[PDB]
Amino acid sequence: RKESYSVYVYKVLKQVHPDTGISSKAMGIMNSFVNDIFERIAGEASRLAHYNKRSTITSREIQTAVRLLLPGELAKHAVSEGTKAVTKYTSS
Amino acid sequence: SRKESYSVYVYKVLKQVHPDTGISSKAMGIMNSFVNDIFERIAGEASRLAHYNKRSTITSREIQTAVRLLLPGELAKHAVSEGTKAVTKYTSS
Amino acid sequence: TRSSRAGLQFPVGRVHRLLRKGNYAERVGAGAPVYLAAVLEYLTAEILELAGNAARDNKKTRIIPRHLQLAIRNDEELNKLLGKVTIAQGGVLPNIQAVLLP
Amino acid sequence: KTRSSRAGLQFPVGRVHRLLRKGNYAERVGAGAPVYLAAVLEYLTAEILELAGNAARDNKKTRIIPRHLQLAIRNDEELNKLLGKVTIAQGGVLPNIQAVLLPKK
Amino acid sequence: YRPGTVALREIRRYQKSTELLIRKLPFQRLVREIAQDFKTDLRFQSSAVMALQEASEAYLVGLFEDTNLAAIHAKRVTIMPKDIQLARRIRGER
Amino acid sequence: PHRYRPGTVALREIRRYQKSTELLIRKLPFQRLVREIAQDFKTDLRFQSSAVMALQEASEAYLVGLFEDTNLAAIHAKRVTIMPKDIQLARRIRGE
Amino acid sequence: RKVLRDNIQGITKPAIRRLARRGGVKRISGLIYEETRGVLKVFLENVIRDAVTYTEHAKRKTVTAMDVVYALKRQGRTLYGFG
Amino acid sequence: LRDNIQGITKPAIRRLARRGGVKRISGLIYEETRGVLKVFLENVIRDAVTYTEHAKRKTVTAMDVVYALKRQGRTLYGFG
Amino acid sequence: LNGGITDMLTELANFEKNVSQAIHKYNAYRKAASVIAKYPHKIKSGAEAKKLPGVGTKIAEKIDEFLATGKLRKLEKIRQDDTSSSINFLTRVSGIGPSAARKFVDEGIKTLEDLRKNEDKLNHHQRIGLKYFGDFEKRIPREEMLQMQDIVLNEVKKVDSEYIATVCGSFRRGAESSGDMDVLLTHPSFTSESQPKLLHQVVEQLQKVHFITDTLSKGETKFMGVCQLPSKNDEKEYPHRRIDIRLIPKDQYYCGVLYFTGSDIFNKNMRAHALEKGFTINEYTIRPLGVTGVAGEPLPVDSEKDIFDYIQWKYREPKDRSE
DNA sequence: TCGAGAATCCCGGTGCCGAGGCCGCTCAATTGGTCGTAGACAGCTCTAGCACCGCTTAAACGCACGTACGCGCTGTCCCCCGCGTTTTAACCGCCAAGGGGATTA
DNA sequence: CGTGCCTGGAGACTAGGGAGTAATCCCCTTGGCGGTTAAAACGCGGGGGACAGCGCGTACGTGCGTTTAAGCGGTGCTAGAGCTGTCTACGACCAATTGAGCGGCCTCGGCACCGGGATTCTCGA
DNA sequence: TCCCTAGTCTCCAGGCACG
């Protein structure tokens, strides 16, 4: 399996468009996109933490790095979804 | 707090290079920034290689590879020569 | 489960372990993996929805890399997100200069 | 005995070791890595400083000015490739005048 | 047919398509030739060769698009080597 | 009466603006513009004087690079005057 | 204590001319000033957004110079010497 | 070897330019294009062989090519 | 029966309070000392006292060392510290605290002789504290405190019959002595939604009758100064005492007086009873507490008994308000 | 091609501030131990990169051939450069209001 | 269609973070005022760059006959990619330990600056 | 300094990923 997220990709795709298929090449491209975004966000968070001299990786720095990376409306919607997700995880 | 910089090492190297040359404090800070930039770049390259090599140690082989990657042109070829010989001294007590 | 507890789709524990083994920080927040998974899911959702729009523009029921590249070029914020990333066999967005036209 | 003296270097070795350990760059750090990094730093610093001193001799100024360092960096090609996306504060730009802009009659 | 009409048709056909348009055997030969300058008797995975070919195609496509944009900027319809050098200087390659 | 050639004071000071390394940007207007731009991001935020000087220097560098690119572009079109269309072409070629 | 606006005109035509001559342009049209102001505003805004974000992530109220350096690296400028 | 740079045919270069949306290409373009192609390929293959040698492996892997392309600033998708 | 441990912990707490500038240690040491003095049993082992809440590792180790050796090495070394002793002596005077005493010791001023010799370096409050350093440290007898309270009440009634002055605190609780006088004053025209000179008139009346001798600070809500009961033309003059008078709204005067009556344990017990009864009780008023903890509109306050019945608690006299 | 004139350079002299230079004081590199283990190394197994060969077929290669568009020529025009003139703002200094910090309750 | 792990929840143990704000007074900070003087705005030739059209020619698309190398279908065949099992150097970690480095405080000439005078381009005729 | 909540190991298992 080599630690892929393809099952999650298919689940989310069916969540968005349950009536369409995906190529294996397309699935690999999406997996690489997810990996690249993860690495970029992680490097941004680490650089922020060192720049803020903190010895932990926290959700505050995650939101900061995401706001750095994503463009305006995309950053607003993504941070909104992340805040709601954190609210649901902490409350429940 | 105590701030760390390579100012003394830079001054000693400059004296070793040009015995009768001065330098400004702003120039010293520029040199410090260059040194820090090269340090961070080499460190990140070596870490990326080690993750690519899935190794848990940072070896002198990774330093040679990092120098071969980041450094351009003849500066790449001479520096490794200066490295391994210096590494030889570390292996020569 | 943790992905059930957050209600998301990507494996949150997988992301936690990836952050742990990524050697990015001494300590890693527990809700930090939730936030990272949420952002990844958001981005993947927007990418897939644009992909489905482009696929139905091409009347094809399979997601194709050409449609993916066309969507990535067609969205301004997404194009600026992944401008320096190349997609295999995705082609290029059709763009003919007006001066080339007769 | 200092490790930089044990290598014969001028830049600090153990300082680099402490920075690399604190840099969270890797799980483990080998001994010869600080030696190689220090050697590379010394070589780059020497190459920059020699060019700067030559420029200052050409500029007839005993101290090194940031413009002198910038001119030296623009003079060398490998350094320019190394520092192409680096800006020198108060370094100016190398004299570059267009041939079409030259006046002829 | 009309000069340009075939050209524009081929332009649109190439922009709609997604193939490589590069001979894989000559590309492998060129990659091996360049690799001989770096390390003799080296092996290359086939998928790696296809990926390198595709990356080369991407770089060439970007460079050619920039060259055409420059030609329109230089009020010229034919792309000339001066445009390629102007783009490479503007793009910061050399 | 002794007026220099119409393209000679222009050729003058180009060497003088290349040999010098000053800011060439008025510091008070730069700080005012910086404060104006930062207020739309956040009201009642402080900017250090060193920060303002560095930002001014960075903007000067970006503008210098863009202007050099535009000069090369005008030379590409066998022209002398720098045009806003040339600046647009340069920005497109950079990718911004 | 009173906020101000319309400082984009603060970049005077003489200033633009000096900057261009430093860049080395023989002749400049008058329309260059407006577009130059626009490009400068765009670049400064792109840098300042990330600068303010870096400042607030550090929960500080002053725009720090190290934050500016981090932003310049984020935008791939990496000015040296300062900080 | 066997003028492998000449392997990029003039019709192939024209096909690439049409994919690049070029309406007319001069005759000198076909050689400088080959030159630039070599330059990009050389600057990529150098780093690739460097990575593979640091891998101490006798075969060039595709993931090495991807890592080098990222080191060359051109992110590529389609290999992992 | 832990007097010595409490005494040695009090001076240790002073080191964390005024010298170390660590309230996070001073308050903890003070709570531990209060609990040790509150235990009517002999302390034999640090582990035995560790059963009491608020006593941890450092406190237990210090108590064991004090019991075994009769002193503490750190305490002995810090008591002999000239800088620490000078800072502690300087902080004893009002107006000088941690930073003030630290700067004074840094500037060579270590004794009251330097304090008098540097009157230019002392502010009005600091000068008043230096002038009345010995007078402020004396206790005020219940007879002298009652006489001064009666004089203040007479001055208030002369200033305004609608003025209401209440002497809260230990004197209200019936203690035979207090270190200072704390008066809570109200006016029917001064409410939560209602003059800035009402306290000024009372201050002028008290100063005119030569009751208040000096004023440290005077605002529209509270005034603090030094006052002293006059002698009968043949006896020694009474020592100066600190008098503070705070003006409160009519709807807030009863809650302020109840809070200032004490004691701290009684206030905590009443607040806990109110919180368990779904109410919040403060110095200003008492408010209902919602199901989500959101406080409603504060209930009207007109008497202490009304507040006690608000939290469903029997009204207790201030003498019974020890805990 | 000189020549007046104007921008530039060089040289002397001047004053001022920072590069270094020194010196006392520390915490971070050194010494010298241990101790779990990363990977080093030997070894074994499958697999994909070669490696090659016959067929096909279409990309390509070379070649007539028109034409258009790059370019060089021309005039022609108007925009911005140079030089002088008139505000003007920035800028350095010089002032006073409030934000943060102090003790104390 | 079993089936093969596996993170999810629950101990077990351990580290940062906050446990007190109001009331009054004072200093540092910051924002506005004012002369002034370099500097920016304005204004006016005019001439030199921008630019539009004409001629042309040659070089590049374009259609076509041909071929040859690239796919493309076999075929095998092994170098080495990858995975496994030890053990062993070896990096990490701990506890003194001293000294390279750091902070503070001179100082004296490098170097900016000024001013004059000599230098040399430079437009104009 | 004491605390309390959150970041580590660890530790099986009803259950998701896999071929």
Q: Are B37 and D88 in contact (CB under 8 A)?
A: no
Q: Which two tokens stand for residue I82?
A: 């000239």
Q: How far is the CA of A66 from the C1' of L12 (A)?
A: 37
Residues 6+ apart with CB under 8 A from G70: A47, A51, G54
For residues I213 and I231, give the distance between their C-alpha atoms in angstroms, rounded to a whole number: 14
Handedness of CA E58, E59, E63, E64 (dihedral sign): negative
Contact I177, I169 (CB under 8 A): no
- In this structure, the number of other CB atoms found within 10 A of the CB of residue I234 comes to 5
Q: Note whether I13 and I26 are within 8 A (CB).
A: yes
In whole angstroms, J16 C1' to G79 CA is: 31
H touches C, CB cut-off 8 Å, minimum 3 pairs: yes
Grouping H, G, I as helix, E, B as strand and the rest as coil, residue C93 is coil
Residue type, F4: Y
Query: What DSSP assignment string belongs to B17-47?
Result: H-TT----HHHHHHHHHHHHHHHHHHHHHHH
Tell me the C-alpha to C-alpha distance, in Å, between residue C5 and each of A6, A86, A89, C8, G3: 21, 10, 6, 8, 47
| Cβ within 8 Å, pair E72-C97 | yes
Pairing of strands F81-82, G27-28: parallel
Considering only CA atoms, give the Rg of chain A: 16
Amino acid at residue number I318: P
- Residue found under tokens 């660590």: I22
The pair of structure tokens assigned to I137 is 């440290």
Question: Are I185 and I255 found together in one domain?
Answer: yes
* Residue G28, beta-bridge partner list: F82
Spatial contact of D87 and G80, defined as CB atoms under 8 Å apart: yes
From residue I192, how far is each of I51, I197, I249, I250 by CA, in Å? Answer: 47, 16, 5, 7
> What is the C-alpha separation between I95 and I104, in angstroms, rounded?
12
Q: Closest residue of E to H50, CA-based?
A: E38
- Nearest residue to D50 via CA among H47, B40, H64, B17: B17
I28-60 exposure pattern, b = at least 16 Cβ within 10 A, e = fewer:
bbbebbebbbebeeebeebebbbeeeebeeebb
Judged by a CB distance cut-off of 8 A, whether residue C98 touches chain E is: no
CA distance C14 to A35: 12
Q: How far is CA B2 from CA A78, B5, C24, F33, I61, in A?
A: 41, 10, 26, 35, 35
The count of domains in chain I is 4
Name the DSSP letter for residue H5.
G
Single-letter amino acid code for the residue at I201 = Q
Q: Please, are residues G17 and F35 in contact by the beta-carbon 8 Å criterion?
A: no
- Residue partners of I65: CB distance under 8 A and separation at least 6: I72, I73
Give every CB contact of residue B25 below 8 A, 6+ residues apart in sequence.
none
Residue I16 half-sphere exposure, CB side, CA atoms within 13 Å?
A: 15
Q: Is E47 exposed, middle or buried (0-12, 13-18, 19+ CB in 10 A)?
A: middle
Domain boundaries, chain F: 8-96
B15 φ, ψ (degrees, to nearest 5): -65, -35
Beta carbons of I246 and I272 less than 8 angstroms apart? no
Ordered by where they begin, the domains of chain A are 1-92 (1.10.20.10)
Torsion sign, CA atoms F37, G33, E92, H8: positive
- Find the CATH number of the domain harbouring I266: 3.30.210.10
Residue C92 in contact with residue E17, Cβ under 8 Å? no
**Residues whose CB falls within 8 Å of the CB of residue I151, separated by 6 or more in sequence, listed in order:** I209, I211, I229
Distance (Å) of CA A49 to CA C26, G24, G57: 10, 42, 9
A88 CB-contact burial (10 Å; exposed 0-12 / middle 13-18 / buried 19+): middle
Instruction: Answer positive or negative: Cα dihedral of I42, I48, I54, I60.
Output: positive
I73 known member of a binding site: no
Q: Are residues I59 and I92 in the same domain?
A: no
The two structure tokens encoding residue E80: 């000339």
* Whether residue I277 sits in one domain with residue I194: no
Angstrom distance (rounded) from CA I64 to CA I41: 16
Look at residue I166 and give its three-state secondary structure: strand
CB atoms within 10 A of CB I247: 24
Tokens of A42: 């992680």
User: Contact at 8 Å (CB) between D65 and B22?
Assistant: no
CA distance B62 to chain H (A): 7
Between CA I63 and CA I48 the distance in angstroms is 10
Whole-angstrom distance, CA of residue D20 vs CA of residue D17: 5
Distance separating alpha carbons of residues E54 and E57, to the nearest angstrom: 5
Write the single-letter amino acid at I234: D
CA geometry: angle I131, I210, I260, nearest 5 deg: 75
CB environment E15-32: b (16+ within 10 A), e (fewer): bebbebbbeeebbbbbbe
- Is strand L within 7 Å of residue I35 (CB)? no
- Cβ atoms within 10 Å of F78's Cβ, excluding its own: 9
* Residue I208, amino acid: K
Burial class (CB in 10 A: 0-12, 13-18, 19+), C35: buried
- Among protein residues, the one whose C-alpha sits closest to the C1' atom of J79 is G29
Instruction: Show which of residues 21-40 on chain H sit within 8 Å of chain E, judged by CB atoms.
Output: 21-26, 28-29, 32-33, 36-40
C-alpha atoms less than 13 angstroms from C-alpha of C21 in its C-beta half-sphere: 11
Q: Which two tokens stand for residue I116?
A: 């008098």
Structure tokens at I322: 């020890």
Rounded Cα distance between F2 and D64, Å, is 41
Residue entry with tokens 């192939």: H12
I99 phi-psi bin (left φ>0, alpha ψ -120 to 50, beta other) = alpha
* Angle, alpha carbons E64-E66-E68 (nearest 5°): 70
Two structure tokens written together for H59: 């075969």
- Contact residues on chain C for D26, CB-CB shorter than 8 A: 23
Residue partners of D11: CB distance under 8 A and separation at least 6: B6, B9, B13, D4, D38, D41, D42, D45
- How many Cβ atoms are within 10 Å of I132's Cβ, its own excluded? 20
In this structure, the dihedral spanned by the alpha carbons of residues I213, I218, I221 and I223, taken in order and rounded to 10 degrees, is -30
Helix (H, G, I), strand (E, B) or coil at A91: helix
* Whether I62 is catalytic: yes
- The Cα-based distances of E38 to B65, E32, H42, H52, H74 in angstroms read 14, 10, 9, 11, 21
Range of the domain at I97: 82-138
Segments of chain D assigned E as strands: 28-29
Nearest Cβ partner for D103 among F7, F18, F20: F7
Comparing CB atoms, the residue among A3, A55, A59 nearest residue C31 is: A59
Q: Which two tokens stand for residue H28?
A: 């000198």
- From I259, I294, I312, give the residue that closes a domain: I259
Is F75–D103 a contact, with Cβ atoms under 8 angstroms apart? no
Q: Which of A37, A36, A32, A12 is nearest to A22 (CA)?
A: A12
Which residues in chain H have Cβ-Cβ distances shorter than 8 Å to E9? none
What is d(CA F95, CA C77) in angstroms, rounded to the nearest whole number? 14
I133 contact partners, CB below 8 Å, separation of at least 6 = I92, I93, I94, I112
In chain G, which residues are followed by a C-to-N distance beyond 2.5 Å, i.e. a gap?
none
* DSSP class of I42: -
Using CA coordinates, name the residue in chain G closest to F71: G25
Residues B19-45 as b/e (b if ≥16 CB within 10 A, e otherwise) read eebebeebbbbbbbbbbbbbbeebbeb
Single-letter amino acid, residue D60: K
Catalogue all structural domains in chain G, each as residue range(s) with its CATH number.
1-82 (1.10.20.10)
Contact between C51 and C63 (Cβ < 8 Å): yes
Cβ I199 vs Cβ I247: under 8 Å: yes
Q: CA–CA distance from C100 to each of A13, F95, H24 (Å)?
A: 40, 21, 10
Query: Does the beta-carbon distance from F51 to G25 stay under 8 Å?
Result: no
β-partners of residue I187 are I190
For residue C77, the Cα-to-chain-centroid distance in whole angstroms is: 12
Residues H74, C86: C-beta atoms closer than 8 Å: yes
DSSP string, D15-44: HHHHHHHHTT--SEE-SHHHHHHHHHHHHH
Q: Report how far residue I86's alpha carbon sits from residue H57's, in angstroms, rounded to the nearest whole number.
A: 74
Contacts 24+ apart (CB under 8 A), G27-36: G27/F7, G27/F10, G27/F80, G27/F81, G27/F82, G28/F81, G28/F82, G29/F81, G29/F82, G29/F83, G29/F84, G31/F83, G31/F84, G32/F82, G32/F83, G32/F84, G32/F87, G34/F84, G35/F84, G35/F87, G35/F88, G36/F63, G36/F87, G36/G11
- Report the DSSP beta bridge partners of residue I247: I185
State in Å, rounded, how far the first CA of chain F is from the last one: 47
Strands C27-28, H75-77: pairing is: unpaired
Give the pairing of strands I164-168 and I180-186.
antiparallel
Give the side-chain half-sphere CA count within 13 A for H49. Answer: 17
**G79 to each of D85, G73, H22, how far by Cα in Å?**
8, 8, 37
Is the CB of D98 inside 8 Å of chain F's CB atoms?
yes
Q: What is the DSSP letter of F4?
A: P
Q: How far apart are CA D59 and CA D40, in angstroms?
A: 28
| DSSP category for residue I289 | B
Q: In the complex, which nucleotide's C1' lies nearest to the CA atom of residue G1?
A: K31
Query: Is the bond preceding residue I231 a cis peptide, omega within 30 degrees?
Result: no
What is the three-state SS of A2-53?
CCCCHHHHHHHHHHHCCCCEECHHHHHHHHHHHHHHHHHHHHHHHHHHHHCC
Residues of A in contact with H78 (CB under 8 A): 25, 28-29, 32
